[PDB]
Amino acid sequence: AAAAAAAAAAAAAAAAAAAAAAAAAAAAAAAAAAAAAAAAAAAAAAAAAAAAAAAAAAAAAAAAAAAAAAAAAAAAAAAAAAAAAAAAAAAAAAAAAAAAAAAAAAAAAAAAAAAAAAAAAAAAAAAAAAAAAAAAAAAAAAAAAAAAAAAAAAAAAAAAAAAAAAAAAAAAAAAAAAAAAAAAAAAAAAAAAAAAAAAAAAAAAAAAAAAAAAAAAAAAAAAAAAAA
């Protein structure tokens, strides 16, 4: 059930069935491609309101702005979104490229989610037991609730950070001005010394500020940032 063409279809809330191997490159403006199998799309499109959903064997390469993203079984995306993102996954893998503003991300499964640029204002990431999120450009208020046995790696230079790890999670944070950390039986690695830092550790919990010793100029912990 293939569909591979470069045209102006432009109005398709297409909830396709299985084996719909649509490698289309058409100008799909009012698009919502909720394919169910075998999507192998390599387009150059423009959507700007896409609430995309993708089930198993969905490899994609698109330069279109989305609004929501849903993953079901297993995927490999490479998308260039622009405006806002409500993203949720299930046991899949995903990558995104351009400057996005992901407000909320809830991953309750094994999700290898990556975003090469996230320029948001308040990114709330909730994680549950299996996922692996690696999103790094620049946030302004990160709230990483890892309720999880999972990993949240970041080189995201957030202005304020609030990371709570609940049961053998592992979160790698980087705070510019405000660092807020609570750990419980888990690990929180601070890769940049904030302007004001505060970390609280529970039972068997490690908020170790694991910056690289011998930087070019590693700034020392000042009188406003020297916590134990």
Binding site: A213, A214, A215, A217, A218, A220, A221
Partner: protein, 138 residues
């Protein structure tokens, strides 16, 4: 029952008038330092002449009031840096007095270097392992 929040210890009038001298000399101190930092801008720090190193990124806490030789020799001994001097020491001791808690050794040497201003300077050469202390020309 009525209570204001800070019910501290009984202080005495000695440290009362010591403290209210100490705040006036503190504000006269910072208004002087404000004047000096505005009418010559500080060109450059000393992180280029004392740069940090892995095995200089240990930490220390120190109160000290003696001469600079013994302190910088102890810093370099526990940094595993070979310590040497350049220039002979003056007859008057160049006396520093470091009272800090939990600072890295590299920034401790920078504070020592600043506190001995224009009488000595600390240089650290980190592709070797030397800490040198060099005296002034006068």
């Amino acid at each position: 029952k009525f209570k204001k929040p800070p019910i501290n210890n009984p202080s005495d009038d000695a440290t009362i008038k010591l403290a209210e001298a100490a705040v006036s000399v503190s504000d006269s101190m910072l208004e002087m330092a404000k004047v000096e930092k505005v009418i010559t801008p500080p060109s450059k720090d000393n992180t280029l002449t004392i740069p940090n190193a892995y095995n200089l990124q240990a930490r220390a806490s120190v109160d000290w009031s003696g001469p600079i030789e013994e302190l910088t020799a102890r810093i370099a001994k526990a940094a595993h840096f070979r310590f040497r001097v350049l220039g002979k020491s003056p007859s008057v001791p160049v006396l520093i007095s470091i009272s800090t808690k939990d600072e890295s050794l590299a920034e401790i040497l920078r504070d020592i270097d600043y506190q001995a201003g224009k009488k000595a300077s600390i240089h650290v050469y980190p592709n070797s392992q030397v800490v040198e202390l060099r005296y002034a020309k006068i």
